[PDB]
Design a protein around this ligand. Structure first.
Ligand SMILES: c1ccc(-c2ccccn2)nc1
Ligand SMILES: c1ccc(-c2ccccn2)nc1
Ligand SMILES: [Zn+2]
Ligand SMILES: [Zn+2]
Ligand SMILES: [Zn+2]
Ligand SMILES: [Zn+2]
Lengths: 374, 374
């Protein structure tokens, strides 16, 4: 009934850097071949969406940002085979074309069809489905979820359980999957292991959850904010450490605590000093450190390569290591089968029109995750 | 007949830093409990032995250095079960006590009984078996192979094929195993893969050999010295690249050459810039870079953590990843079963008394490996 026609709707457009989002009436073109138009039901606010505002995640402006979300398919273009009008879906900010050597690779997930490396802010065909009073508006990571309606390429969407609570499983579009995958997939945490998690916001809590699912015996939470500790223990942390309580460097504290270094450490805050710290506190011979967050305006870090020469392994990933379209549905299936709870991560829920408020909660540190509802 | 008594023999003592070795008459005490006295048959000259001379590998002086070697057991102390008078043996500069959590760990090989981390320059019991005119002389890495005779702890020795040519299989004590393991064990090079090897001295040639054994489809040799290229191709390299031939940075050249990055890269030269280069030239999503050499007087390197956030894996090891006592005999068995040739690495052979000459060949770059014969 709206199929094949322009939809007039509201979206949160960022017209310029360092400005609040403007709720604007926009037009959303019908989906072309192999494109999918989605009515949004919920979208989380992620740190990476704010990097667009700060200018640190360089991408074309004006933009409709947002990339952690869920909704319902409104319609499909020619040749779409993987979703149908009515399906519950999660947009995939990391695509899975299934053809490139990354998608072919049994370990790789950073599909070369991504728009993160060298952002164009378009659909795969190099155009935009968005206008604001006839002006073109750029897409973001092929998702653009801060809109009542969006069009994504088929390679950027996954069909999920028709019975999922979208207001919750939207977290699987970024924050949860990223954390949880870091443990379960990238690091491959083993049973009886000792883990250390640097940063206890939403993505850190999700690492803790993955470490617990993997059967870690000790999960050491590390953050300078004490108030973060209760929820960390509530989701699986055995102990919590505030570095400001100590007179010695924190990697020494953690090495002592773990009788000569942890099995797996995770940097989830995105700071250069804590990255090196995290690597050092893991056991010199067989320790693994995983880099989860970054600052997209990153300087270089400075590290001593002897930390690696003893036998350490240092690594990062995007989207928790997960091949996106393959994994998103099983993660929802797991939630549905109650293998893990998402409610501990949701601290604030706001209507979409109060997006700017939600970003204030994010910028201030007062929320773990704000979910916006359409 | 010498069992249980002091042996008077010659050794190459370094009395002070930055000095030539002095061939001195020394006394070698009989082995105590769980110690093994070995008559040396051959010893290679390694870059790490020279780091002792430069003062960059800090270890107590005066010292008898050397750690890549083979010989014949002269006698055994009380309770030695793993070798017997007459056995052909390789001293293990990385021990395998078999008890510590590293030796227990299915991936780790840097046994915590090592004397590399915080060198004491003793036997495990904290004493020395060496005197020079009654002055005590320090051990080195529990091996001290620049001596006609040495005493090692049982955890620092492995019994090998009674039919091995010791003049060749001595390379398995460091240089070969380190290179070969880096490919086969640490990186786990896969079939059809594209590999890049930065540095084509002895340890680099050994990486090439491991990559070929693993079934790599492309092995790209990288060195600034053209003269090194023939022997690289002779042992398995498909192509060779001199960065001085190019007008653009070498990681760009290698990324282009490999259609968007190599599967596995290896830094074998020990330079901070080439370490970062090596990591960058591997494929962003599933690339692995392995650090093989170091400079023990190392500054920090400077790198951008975004290189890891895409999906790269960065790692180092000691002794090629190999659990030493477990692996040394099978590596000799493999040589004996002709699964790989060691003669391509041996460019110079000298009597032990011309040790200083051999180090000159090493310092100058004129040899790939000098073997000293007793
Ligand atoms: C934690 C860490 C990273 C990211 C991320 C990176 C790129 C694009 C979008 N989100 N999100 C949460
Ligand atoms: C290549 C790279 C490293 C080493 C090494 C390191 C520590 C002690 C001894 N040898 N040898 C050859
Ligand atoms: Zn792909
Ligand atoms: Zn995100
Ligand atoms: Zn051990
Ligand atoms: Zn060596």
């Amino acid at each position: 009934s709206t199929a094949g026609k322009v939809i007039k709707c509201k979206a949160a457009v960022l017209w310029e850097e360092k400005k609040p989002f403007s709720i604007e009436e926009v037009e959303v073109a019908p989906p072309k071949a192999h494109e999918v138009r989605i009515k949004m039901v919920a979208t989380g606010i992620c740190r990476s969406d704010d990097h667009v505002v700060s200018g640190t995640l360089v991408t074309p402006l004006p933009v409709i940002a947002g990339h952690e979300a869920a909704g319902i398919v409104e319609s499909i273009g020619e040749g779409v085979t993987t979703v149908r009008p009515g399906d519950k879906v999660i947009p995939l900010f990391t695509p899975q074309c299934g053809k490139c050597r990354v998608c072919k690779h049994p370990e790789g997930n950073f599909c070369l069809k991504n728009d993160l490396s060298m952002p164009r802010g378009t659909m795969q065909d190099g155009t935009s489905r968005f206008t604001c009073r006839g002006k073109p508006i750029h897409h973001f990571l092929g998702t653009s979820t801060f809109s009542q309606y969006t069009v994504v390429d088929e390679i950027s969407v996954a069909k999920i359980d028709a019975a999922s609570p979208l207001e919750k499983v939207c977290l699987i579009g970024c924050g949860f999957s990223t954390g949880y995958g870091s443990a379960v997939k990238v690091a491959k945490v083993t049973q009886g292991s000792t883990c250390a998690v640097f940063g206890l916001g939403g993505v850190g809590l999700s690492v803790i959850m993955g470490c617990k699912a993997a059967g870690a015996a000790r999960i050491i939470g590390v953050d300078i904010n004490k108030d973060k500790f209760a929820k960390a223990k509530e989701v699986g942390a055995t102990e919590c450490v505030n570095p400001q309580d100590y007179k010695k460097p924190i990697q020494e504290v953690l090495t002592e605590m773990s009788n000569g270094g942890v099995d797996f450490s995770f940097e989830v805050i995105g700071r250069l000093d804590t990255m090196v710290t995290a690597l050092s506190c893991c056991q010199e011979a067989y320790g693994v450190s995983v880099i989860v967050g970054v600052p997209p305006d990153s300087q270089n870090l400075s590290m001593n390569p002897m930390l690696l020469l003893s036998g350490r392994t240092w690594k990062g990933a995007i989207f928790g290591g997960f091949k996106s379209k393959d994994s998103v549905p099983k993660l929802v299936a797991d939630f549905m089968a109650k293998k893990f709870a998402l409610d501990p991560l949701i601290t604030h829920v706001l209507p979409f029109e109060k997006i700017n408020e939600g970003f204030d909660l994010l910028r201030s540190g007062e929320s773990i995750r704000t979910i916006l509802t359409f």
